[PDB]
Amino acid sequence: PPGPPGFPGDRGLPGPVGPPGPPGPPG
Amino acid sequence: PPGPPGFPGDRGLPGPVGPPGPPGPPG
Amino acid sequence: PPGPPGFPGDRGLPGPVGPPGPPGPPG
Structure with a gap:
């Protein structure tokens, strides 16, 4: 008979x- | 006997x- | 026979x- 699954x-590996983010607000 | 598992x-596939990072600090 | 795969x-999870972004413009 066939074996089980x-x-x-x-x-999976983490992404x-x-x-990096964009520039902050102007000073 | 049944076959092997x-x-x-x-x-799984990579995530x-x-x-993207948050905005930087103020200028 | 062996079982199915x-x-x-x-x-995987999102990274x-x-x-953080760089400091913003001098303004």
Whole structure:
């Protein structure tokens, strides 16, 4: 008889860090 | 006897890029 | 026969927030 389903996979890697933000308000 | 368990699932796909940084400090 | 493949892993989490932007214009 056929075996049972394989074990579910691991969660993926986290995404990369986001890019830098934009310039702040004028002084 | 039944066959072996199936092959393990693949790791999930990488997550999306993180959000852009917040605005900088005042000038 | 071996069982079917395992369910694929769930997608990774979004990355953390990017660095703060630079200081704003001198104004």
